[PDB]
């Protein structure tokens, strides 16, 4: 088909006529000892499956606070009766005690 | 096809007929005119905000400006758009200064 | 190199959204993947993407991780003794070599990829909760039947990955879809709904199964359909697979022969409502439930010795439908014992039941393909002479493709480093190992 | 034909007529990558709502955020922001049941 | 041909320097059709104000 | 104002899988479909169901019509020049007149 | 071959002094795979303290 | 394969290719290093306590 295929030893091939990317015209799915080449009367192309020989990962501890967290916070001091000159502190905690 | 100035009203199907070899360059130049005419203001289109554009697409009814289905539960300042502080502002004006003043 | 993440300590509020993106240390063509420790709790959209939105769903400390991969080419190890079998299904091309995953080239794709759902097995983690545990799966030969894909000589690995070879195993996949290959291969696919972070089980009323037949020495050499009926060969004894069209496990396999069995992995073709098989002893042409020997006492005793001299396992057959011929491919009488290039071919014309012989140019493989030499200008070119030769009378579509491609011609994959036509003008190409040169000589018919 | 343009800057008045136009395929790649870079999110962009363009074109003065001139005659429910009944609701909460009990 | 593909989302380098010449005009038709599909209305889009 | 008032027959598509497609020709024969691809053929058998009744089964692996108008039903059989020779097939069996 | 066997639980004396030589390396691969399966994580297991 | 010091990160599948006859002894010695490195504290492992 092209001058470059004369240096190849085809182990097997498929004469598929139809393809999405190109019109077709015998884009032979040919196999070799190491690659899966492809010639379609215009040039030879390599379509072998590339694999990820090097893989690197990362982590992210995404804290998920509750939507109802600062809503109706737990307040045990419903009544805070004190003297006119009292200086008593007030304590309260949010629901689930998360973030806000 | 020289005539298209309103843009997007071209004729992609047929009047090409796979002919003449040489109008392809002219079509590319014509397409450049159409693209430039539609958006002759580009400096840094980094406002992609796909979610913003996509959501408003399902709205499709925004004719009276915003007409949002929400309540616009965010604002910072001004006597214009009113937050929940309007009620707090009202009682301060009504009690502290205007109606129920000190010793009332 | 080292991959970082935009946000690693996000604080959402059940419904809040945040888009975290992965940033590898170098820059280039890298694929992306994402993972998480708990199911759900985040609405990860298109986990294969680089920047993923995560909508909080439930309270709890979650651990979201990304995955960046380096797209690089890797050479295959398909030696001559283990060539490609190149099956076809749903307009997609399958590779199917030894030591490698079967692999498929999708109709809407240009790069080969491992078969979707291949190696998947929904195995319960502990006494329950069936999860899709992907195990290492390697096959021997893959073919198609009734919109499915099949597997032979399955080597099924698992957890505790000391793999065990199953020469008796035979697996089938689901039905295909619009320009897509079958999607799953797990036998226990069902009993799993709503699997998010995110496997998917949306089939076409066809599941996957395995039969694990019982015969002599197994090795499950070859399989070939015939009029909606399977015919599997073991080099000894054969079975017929009849699909019953049920929801799950529809295939029913029944014994056919007790002595028949194919010689080579590519030694059966469907010629005319029947199979052409050289069953390790002679040539058999069987139409189902009945078999007749084309080589009873005509070409038996001189085919058997010729094939056995060098390499019986290099046998191949091909259907030459244009001239109603079916030939069997084999190595020549004088050849290296490790050579798999077929030198001589015994041709049988089924239109008149006559046998003959012919020489082939060291065939490594054979097939029918459209003719080359279609005149065109693949690379855009003008030089500086005519200015693209402005065509008169408009132009003729730049090329003729309205007429369907025809004059389909048999082609041969040759050991002589190239492609050769087998049925063309009288000429022959011998090989000279003394000088390592290919010599062309006129074809000598005797 | 240049090369590195991603700011929707495609020069259409510098080609050529007798020499190589073996870039029309490359022009298509250049045109495509410009479109992809500007808007890398396209699935169904019906979200134009052309009447809204005319309405906001009448404004044309979007420099200090929105400056909306609409009506925003929508509100679902809340005990906070109120319609023209602000004066009535205030003297309900301040007097009717909060301060001035029945028989005031 | 190119079937089952819609919108200008196909990967770049489609011409691949090797498409004869009959794919160039087909690319233009695909670009024109997809561009029309993306924004099937244009009157005077001067209302960008990139700021 | 579209209307859907059918005659218990719907519309469907099969999207077959064969060599190079192009689906050159189709011709019925005794309530059985025969489609040609210039290579390999399929038989379409209607099962008379409410929706998607047609079932298509493979018939030949080498046969296939040459021209879009190269098949006629002569006598309970099809006259086909299948790119190699003349074939007169009555269904599930084929003979070469040429 | 050795199929349907996982984990180093097979009975000893498998070489049986008669396995040609092609089973010795297969045994090593099985041992390596099973050992990897048993403890698929090793950083610094000095934390034994047999006492 | 000399390089493995983190242990359990070996390569059992392929780089053997059923070749060279003589690396089997080296692999056995290498496996001994991996086993000893993981657990260099053994006096009487009678605390099986499988449950």
């Amino acid at each position: 088909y092209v001058d470059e295929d004369k240096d190849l030893t085809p182990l097997s091939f498929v004469s598929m006529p139809f393809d999405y990317y190109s019109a077709g015209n015998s884009f032979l799915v040919v196999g070799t000892n190491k690659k899966l080449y492809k010639l379609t009367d215009e040039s030879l192309t390599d379509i072998s499956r590339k694999v990820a020989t090097v893989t690197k990962k990362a982590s992210a501890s995404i804290k998920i606070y509750p939507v109802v967290s600062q809503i109706v916070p737990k307040e045990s001091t419903i009544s805070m009766n004190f003297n006119q000159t009292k200086n008593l502190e007030v304590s309260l905690l949010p629901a689930d005690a998360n973030n806000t | 096809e020289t005539n298209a100035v309103v843009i997007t009203d071209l004729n992609p199907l047929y009047p090409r007929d796979r002919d003449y070899i040489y109008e392809g360059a002219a079509q590319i130049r014509l397409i450049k005119q159409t693209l430039q005419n539609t958006f002759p203001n580009v400096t840094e289109p980094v406002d992609i905000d796909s979610d913003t554009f996509k959501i408003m697409s399902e709205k499709l009814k925004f004719t009276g400006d915003a007409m949002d289905v929400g309540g616009l539960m965010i604002k910072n300042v001004t006597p214009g758009t009113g937050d929940k502080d309007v009620v707090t502002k009202g009682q301060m004006e009504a009690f502290m200064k205007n109606w129920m003043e000190n010793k009332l | 190199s080292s991959v970082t993440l935009d946000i690693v300590s996000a604080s959402l509020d059940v419904g809040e959204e945040i888009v975290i993106t992965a940033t590898a240390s170098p820059e280039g063509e890298y694929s992306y993947q994402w993972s998480v420790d708990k199911t759900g709790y985040v609405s990860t959209t298109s986990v294969t993407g680089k920047s993923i939105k995560l909508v909080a769903l439930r309270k709890g400390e979650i651990n979201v991780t990304c995955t960046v991969s380096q797209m690089t080419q890797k050479d295959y190890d398909a030696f001559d003794d283990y060539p490609w079998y190149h099956a076809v299904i749903s307009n997609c091309a399958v590779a199917t070599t030894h030591y490698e995953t079967p692999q498929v080239k999708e109709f809407e794709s240009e790069y080969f990829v491992d078969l979707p759902g291949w190696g998947e097995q929904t195995v319960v983690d502990n006494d329950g909760n069936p999860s899709v545990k992907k195990f290492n799966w390697k096959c021997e030969r893959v073919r198609s039947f009734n919109n499915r894909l099949f597997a032979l000589n399955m080597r099924e690995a698992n957890a505790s990955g000391v793999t065990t070879n199953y020469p008796l195993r035979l697996r089938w996949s689901n039905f295909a879809n619009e320009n897509k290959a079958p999607t799953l291969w797990d036998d226990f696919a069902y009993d799993r709904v709503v699997s998010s972070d995110g496997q998917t089980q949306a089939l076409e009323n066809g599941y996957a199964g395995y039969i694990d037949l019982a015969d002599s020495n197994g090795s499950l050499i070859d399989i070939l359909p015939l009029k909606d009926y399977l015919f599997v060969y073991t080099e000894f004894e054969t079975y017929i697979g009849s699909p019953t069209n049920n929801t799950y496990q529809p295939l029913m396999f029944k014994k056919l022969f007790n002595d028949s069995g194919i010689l080579a992995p590519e030694c059966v073709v469907e010629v005319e409502g029947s199979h052409f098989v050289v069953t390790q002893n002679d040539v058999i042409l069987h139409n189902g439930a009945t078999k007749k020997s084309i080589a009873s006492n005509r070409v038996k005793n001189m085919l058997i010795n010729e094939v056995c001299l060098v390499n019986p396992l290099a046998t191949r057959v091909h259907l030459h439908q244009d001239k109603k011929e079916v030939w069997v491919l084999y190595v020549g009488p004088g050849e290296p014992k490790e050579s798999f290039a077929c030198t001589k071919a015994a041709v049988w014309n089924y239109e008149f039941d006559t046998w003959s012989f012919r020489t082939i140019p060291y065939a490594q493989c054979i097939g029918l393909v459209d003719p080359p030499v279609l005149e065109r200008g693949p690379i855009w070119s003008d030089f500086q002479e005519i200015t693209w030769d402005d065509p008169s009378i408009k132009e003729l579509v730049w090329r003729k493709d309205a007429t369907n491609f025809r004059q389909r011609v048999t082609i041969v994959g040759s050991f002589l480093k190239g492609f050769y036509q087998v049925d063309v003008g009288a000429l022959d190409y011998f090989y000279d190992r003394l000088n390592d040169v290919v010599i062309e000589k006129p074809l000598e018919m005797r």
Side-chain angles (χ1 to χ4, degrees), chain A residues 25-66 73:
Chain A
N25 323 303
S26 286
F27 64 110
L28 274 164
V29 187
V30 74
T32 66
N33 310 285
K34 294 170 65 77
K35 298 290 199 308
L36 273 72
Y37 278 100
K38 179 175 71 175
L39 74 171
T40 182
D41 198 80
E42 58 203 59
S43 179
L44 186 65
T45 45
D46 192 90
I47 55 170
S48 313
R49 182 258 299 162
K50 290 185 175 65
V51 71
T53 74
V54 179
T55 51
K56 308 281 159 279
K57 274 75 66 179
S59 197
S61 175
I62 296 174
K63 179 65 181 70
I64 306 169
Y65 284 148

Side-chain angles (χ1 to χ4, degrees), chain B residues 5-25:
Chain B
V5 296
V6 298
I7 315 304
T8 302
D9 277 316
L10 279 75
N11 210 300
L13 168 58
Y14 165 40
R16 193 273 310 281
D17 215 340
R18 300 184 179 273
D19 295 339
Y20 186 55
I21 288 288
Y22 195 73
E23 275 177 352

Side-chain angles (χ1 to χ4, degrees), chain C residues 149-202:
Chain C
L149 277 182
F150 281 73
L152 314 183
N153 199 46
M154 182 45 207
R155 282 92 56 82
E156 199 176 295
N158 56 4
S160 81
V162 64
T163 190
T164 54
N165 191 346
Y166 297 95
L168 307 182
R169 194 57 61 93
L170 190 146
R171 310 193 74 112
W172 57 79
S173 63
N174 319 119
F175 307 103
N177 280 330
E178 189 49 283
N179 296 318
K180 277 172 56 178
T183 78
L184 297 178
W185 285 77
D186 44 348
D187 179 41
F188 313 142
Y190 75 91
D191 203 342
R192 187 224 56 63
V193 190
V194 190
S195 62
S196 63
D197 281 349
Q199 53 271 0
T200 55
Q201 294 177 336

Side-chain angles (χ1 to χ4, degrees), chain C residues 355-371:
Chain C
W355 276 96
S356 193
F357 296 86
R358 70 157 298 173
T359 303
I360 66 178
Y362 305 86
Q364 297 278 34
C365 51
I366 192 164
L368 190 67
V369 67
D370 307 331

Side-chain angles (χ1 to χ4, degrees), chain C residues 105-143:
Chain C
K105 176 200 172 299
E106 293 271 51
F107 175 84
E108 311 196 14
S109 185
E110 281 298 313
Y111 284 163
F112 269 87
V113 70
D114 294 332
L115 267 172
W118 178 262
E120 290 207 324
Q121 268 298 102
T122 67
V123 173
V124 290
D125 60 359
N126 173 78
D127 294 330
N129 320 126
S131 65
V132 185
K133 299 194 192 293
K134 292 178 72 68
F135 303 141
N136 186 263
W137 281 13
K138 296 189 177 191
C139 194
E140 180 66 26
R141 279 169 276 279
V142 162
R143 317 287 178 66

Side-chain angles (χ1 to χ4, degrees), chain C residues 114-313:
Chain C
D114 294 332
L115 267 172
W118 178 262
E120 290 207 324
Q121 268 298 102
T122 67
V123 173
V124 290
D125 60 359
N126 173 78
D127 294 330
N129 320 126
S131 65
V132 185
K133 299 194 192 293
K134 292 178 72 68
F135 303 141
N136 186 263
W137 281 13
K138 296 189 177 191
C139 194
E140 180 66 26
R141 279 169 276 279
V142 162
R143 317 287 178 66
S144 77
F145 171 79
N146 278 46
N147 217 341
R148 303 186 136 109
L149 277 182
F150 281 73
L152 314 183
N153 199 46
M154 182 45 207
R155 282 92 56 82
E156 199 176 295
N158 56 4
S160 81
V162 64
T163 190
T164 54
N165 191 346
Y166 297 95
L168 307 182
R169 194 57 61 93
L170 190 146
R171 310 193 74 112
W172 57 79
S173 63
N174 319 119
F175 307 103
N177 280 330
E178 189 49 283
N179 296 318
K180 277 172 56 178
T183 78
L184 297 178
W185 285 77
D186 44 348
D187 179 41
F188 313 142
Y190 75 91
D191 203 342
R192 187 224 56 63
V193 190
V194 190
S195 62
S196 63
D197 281 349
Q199 53 271 0
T200 55
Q201 294 177 336
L203 292 186
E204 207 268 325
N205 53 70
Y207 283 102
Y210 63 85
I211 50 175
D212 215 326
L213 292 162
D215 53 4
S216 304
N217 294 113
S219 183
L220 203 70
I221 294 92
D222 207 3
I223 178 173
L224 203 78
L226 175 47
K227 207 72 161 293
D228 205 68
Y229 277 150
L230 277 298
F231 291 77
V232 294
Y233 309 84
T234 303
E235 193 176 51
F236 289 104
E237 315 177 40
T238 71
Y239 276 84
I240 279 181
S242 310
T244 65
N245 196 84
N246 296 116
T247 62
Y248 161 72
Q249 302 306 105
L251 277 77
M252 196 303 278
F253 279 81
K254 202 50 172 35
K255 212 171 193 292
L256 175 62
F257 294 137
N258 297 312
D259 48 1
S260 173
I262 201 175
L263 160 63
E266 207 268 327
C267 183
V268 59
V269 298
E270 175 191 342
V271 62
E272 282 200 358
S274 71
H275 274 156
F276 182 91
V277 177
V278 185
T279 180
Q280 193 83 2
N281 303 331
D282 57 344
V283 178
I284 298 296
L285 183 63
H286 76 84
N287 56 65
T290 57
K291 69 184 176 69
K292 318 167 280 294
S293 189
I294 310 304
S296 297
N297 59 290
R298 317 213 314 273
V299 296
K300 211 172 80 67
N301 279 80
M302 61 80 71
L303 258 66
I304 179 164
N305 63 7
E306 181 46 50
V307 177
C308 184
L309 294 174
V310 176
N311 191 15
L313 271 74

